[PDB]
Amino acid sequence: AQKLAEEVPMDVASYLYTGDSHQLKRANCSGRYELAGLPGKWPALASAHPSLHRALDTLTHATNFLNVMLQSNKSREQNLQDDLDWYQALVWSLLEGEPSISRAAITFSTQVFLQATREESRILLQDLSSSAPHLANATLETHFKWSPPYLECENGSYKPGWLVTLSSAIYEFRGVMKVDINLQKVDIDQCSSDGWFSGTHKCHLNNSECMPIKGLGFVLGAYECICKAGFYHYVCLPCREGCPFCADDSPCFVQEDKYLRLAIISFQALCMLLDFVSMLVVYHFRKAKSIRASGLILLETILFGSLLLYFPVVILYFEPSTFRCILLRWARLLGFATVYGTVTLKLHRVLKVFLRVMRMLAVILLVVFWFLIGWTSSVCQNLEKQISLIGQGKTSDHLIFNMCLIDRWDYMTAVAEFLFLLWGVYLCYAVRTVPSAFHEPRYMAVAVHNELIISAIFHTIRFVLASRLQSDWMLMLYFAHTHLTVTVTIGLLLIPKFS
Amino acid sequence: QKLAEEVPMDVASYLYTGDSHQLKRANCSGRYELAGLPGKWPALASAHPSLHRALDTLTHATNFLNVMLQSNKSREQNLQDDLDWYQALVWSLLEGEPSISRAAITFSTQVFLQATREESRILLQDPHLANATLETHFKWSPPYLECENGSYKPGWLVTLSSAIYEFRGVMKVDINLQKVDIDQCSSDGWFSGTHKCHLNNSECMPIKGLGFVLGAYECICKAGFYHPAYVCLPCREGCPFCADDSPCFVQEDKYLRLAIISFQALCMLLDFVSMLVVYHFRKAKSIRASGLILLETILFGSLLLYFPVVILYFEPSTFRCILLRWARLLGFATVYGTVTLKLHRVLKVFLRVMRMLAVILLVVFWFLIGWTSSVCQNLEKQISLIGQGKTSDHLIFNMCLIDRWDYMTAVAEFLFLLWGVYLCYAVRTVPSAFHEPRYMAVAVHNELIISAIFHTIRFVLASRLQSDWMLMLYFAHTHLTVTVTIGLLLIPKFS
């Protein structure tokens, strides 16, 4: 909030405050004290580096000692002979204790003053008021008195150190003691809650975090903004998708040949439309030798089942959800039933006549619905929200991909399909020479064996290696599998009834 | 360790250093002062800032005297007017901090001055430390109790000592270390040991109040409870919060459980000898209606159907619940299937069944295999277990759990018996040699009603059923249903 004000009230110091480099500041011509009154905070009585605290502690003891000596009975005011020696020793003592105090001075008038500075390694002293002198300010107040940040000027040359005046009254006021703490080698944290001008004006919220350096100098721009799960290119930005550790801002999710996806879905919808078209057609041709050999209801049922079996191809095109996988199972399972049950049930009707199918079908769908209702409940109730989840993102050893998962339930269902087809294989093997005007049983058995073999292969391939199948190979596998099986099973039962 | 050595070198102070009650100490007459020589450490720690403040005020006053007396033109007409300066010097040495009791400086440049915060007015007036200073920077001391024409004075003092320049001076502050809390269970603090609290099963937990006093800690025993000196106890079998050290694994009568198992095994043996008898009477006029293979099939199903009453008598495990499911399901099938199918044969003749039975057995084995696999493969090790713990009022009990699979199973049994019901209602006017359909239908209706009631009561409130009530319920259900179903088909074939 003051970053703009700080960038419009400095010329030589401006660079020095942001870089620590004395080489510009030493060439800048000075005219008076170059301190800052407003850019800083309220005060440094709480949040301050240890040095400052010690600096104040020194003055405190030196102020209490003088106060008690000035408030003692029969105050002599014999400042001529040896009082000046006491005060000079009291000032050299004031300096000698803290390792971060650069000048110190004492002055009073009731007309002399002494000061000292840490010159090279020893204390230089002089008989002249030198350093801090808030006497004019203390008199105007007439306790403690701090000051702002300020650069000292020596022989018309901006000093290369940031000083602070501390001032305290001597007791009515009649003295001003002042230490000039050298605040040049102090730490400052713009990311701290309550401290020296806590302004972290470089990284606010978006993938932001301030982890600053410990030992740098009384200088700013020393706080490495951290990219909280994002890209690091002294700037933080967002990442392509749900893929953290963006060592590059490149993508993690595999690509999709959409050109190959739209053809897939379009051909599937074409086949579904043609199936519905076939159902209407058979509803038109109800007086031919269709009805006599194979009832209309059974054929419309087969076609509705096949329509109910194309669903997986379109379910897999969309993004994997947890409502989808379930519908994938319902469709597959229920259509298999309503299609091959009546297929083999029709064969059963034949073998029985050689020596009433809907009642003997609804048993199948009842068992099916019972199993489905159970599976769905066990998933939705316990293993969808509590611990387990179907939708799983697996890695291809360098890239990820989502998919529906499999479970033992699928293994046993495939086995059921196998055995249910086994009954039809033996049934078809039995009726190998039964009188027929249209030879339907021949085509039925072909469909049955096709489904059995093709389904075994597909299920094996699906359950072996589902950890390394991206979302464009499974689509092709489900498409080539369903097209072969179902389209053959439809043609073999429909085609011959028009010729 | 030095806890035993600290409890063998005290008389009155020992109790005054653990309670902090001046009322005993003030009655104990003492010649001179005494201090705890053994302070299990030295005076160079950062436990309280007070000591830091009183070292700061001492080092700041010692830095002045050492830089004044040793400065240039130090002529030192020491008796004329310097005394005024030194008096202001010592008076201000204790008029800066809040906890410093006496302060004094001695010099030969003998001369000495002192000042003490008496009540609220700091009076200003005109040994070991000075002697050790002559013998020998900063020089601290240990914890020590003062006393003079008093008793052992009721205050813990510390001597701070320094020198000037050689050794021509001795300034001392007596920091009042009486209002300084101590952590007996700190990693680094004064008296940092363990009076009588073993961490094997417990944790200290210090407080923030009182004053310097040993035994200022309330120990906490984890995985157990304390005596209601405070020390720890190993808790009861598998019960982590023992408000009492009483047991949680609820009382279970044995002279009921034994009778139950006895009666069940008696019925099994009676069922087995019911099988052998049938195998003796392979020749009769009764079996022509109800074949031999059908009855032995019913009796073997019944025999295994009894299993649930004996499984629950044992401690429940993961292998147990699974066999409970298998047995119940498998036996229901192999009995009521052939029952219902005999009625079907009757109705069809009115206008073998082993081949029309293995279908059901196949469907059952298929579901069982799947259920067992999904259980043992996923939800037995990952996050999920069969062992479930419920509570009756405020007390626990172990048992097997249920899952939606059981509800759907019950529905299947219902529907299978509704087929039997219709099949029984269709055949209500046939002639017969033994009126078997009459008793069969009686068994079916009974099975349906009792089966519905039991499964409902079983699912509704299984979280509040201690492990002696479920056994009684299984006893009642299985005895009623199965024993009726056996009698109604067997009994009439001997009369």
Numbering used by the authors:
A (entry chain A): 71 to 180, 189 to 220, 262 to 290, 299 to 360, 390 to 511, 525 to 668
B (entry chain B): 72 to 180, 189 to 205, 211 to 220, 262 to 290, 299 to 361, 389 to 511, 525 to 668
Quote the original article.
GPR158, a class C orphan GPCR, functions in cognition, stress-induced mood control, and synaptic development. Among class C GPCRs, GPR158 is unique as it lacks a Venus flytrap-fold ligand-binding domain and terminates Gαi/o protein signaling through the RGS7-Gβ5 heterodimer. Here, we report the cryo-EM structures of GPR158 alone and in complex with one or two RGS7-Gβ5 heterodimers. GPR158 dimerizes through Per-Arnt-Sim-fold extracellular and transmembrane (TM) domains connected by an epidermal growth factor-like linker.
